[PDB]
UniProtKB/Swiss-Prot annotation, chain A:
Part of the whole protein covered: 50 to 182 of 550
Record-given protein name: Methyl-accepting chemotaxis protein PcaY
Region (Ligand-binding domain): 1-133
Positions with a binding annotation for salicylate: 22, 26, 86
Domain notes: The ligand-binding domain (LBD) forms a four-helix bundle (4HB), and both ligand binding sites of the dimer are occupied with the high-affinity ligands protocatechuate and quinate, whereas the lower-affinity ligands benzoate and salicylate are present in only one site. Ligand binding causes rigid-body scissoring movements of both monomers of the dimer.
Entry's localization field: Cell inner membrane
Effect listed in the UniProt record for changing residue 93 to A: Strong decrease in quinate binding and small decrease in affinity for salicylate
The encoding gene: pcaY
Consequence of gene loss (knockout): Disruption of the gene abolishes chemotaxis to benzoate, quinate, protocatechuate and shikimate. Inactivation of the gene does not alter competitive plant root colonization.
Effect of residue 24 to A: Abolishes binding of quinate and protocatechuate, and shows reduced affinity for benzoate and salicylate
Binding site for L-quinate: 22-29, 86, 93, 109
Subunit composition and interactions: Ligand free PcaY_PP-ligand-binding domain (LBD) is present in a monomer-dimer equilibrium. Only the dimeric LBD is able to bind ligands which in turn causes dimer stabilization.
Binding annotation for benzoate: 22, 26
Length: 133, 142
């Protein structure tokens, strides 16, 4: 029973991070589509970025709710905080894209890239801790 | 022993998760780098081109190692598809980087569909491989 919880936790963690980076990739792609006048195509990218933000946030929330073991509590709260910092940056990318502002996009993009760099290394720390039961 | 094959199954799914994560991060760097370049932030865009290269090279090495270790027929067909699909993806992202260096929206769009189509297939193949690896880990325990 503990082991089936582990697989659900792993699906939540991996899907959350894949959907989160896809959310940012979509809004960047959509910004470029707007630059090229592909304005209908760009709306599909923006909608997917929004949806992927919502779905990935829900999975992080579930992961943290279910990571009660003492070895995981601190790291899971670190994940919650770093993920929130990433999601805030991607929300900033969406707002820059709606305003069609190259400079607003640059401002927040460094925050996005730095938080995702940390999410990759934090994910590996979580995978190590999950596998040690 | 069971823990050996179990340990190797976990190692394989982890290779797969890191490869897909870094592959999508590579895209995020080239697209956001193009936006930075167009805003006059040439230095940051250059760093992002380098990071896109690094990330897809690391992903490629993980994909190659995954295929080398996916010997069972339940996995090998999916694994070689993942490899062939990654090659398509990596070539399109390289096209996106060169379009960025040339400051060319037209060059960028010319390959942007190749990248998205390959990435979509990569994500489905990862899903099939994760499920098939998990099935093998459970078969051992059964």
């Amino acid at each position: 029973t503990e082991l089936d919880q582990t697989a659900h936790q792993s699906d939540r963690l991996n899907n959350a991070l894949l959907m989160a980076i896809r959310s940012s990739a979509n809004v960047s792609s959509g910004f470029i589509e707007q630059l090229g006048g592909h304005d209908e195509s760009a709306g599909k990218r923006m909608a997917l970025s929004v949806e992927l933000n919502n779905k990935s946030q829900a999975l992080v929330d579930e992961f943290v709710e279910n990571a009660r073991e003492p070895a995981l509590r601190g790291l899971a709260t670190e994940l919650q905080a770093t993920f929130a910092e990433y999601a805030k940056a991607v929300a900033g990318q969406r707002e820059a894209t709606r305003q069609r502002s190259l400079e607003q996009y640059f401002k927040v993009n460094s925050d996005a890239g730095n938080a995702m760099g940390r999410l990759q290394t934090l994910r590996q720390q979580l995978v190590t801790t999950l596998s040690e039961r």
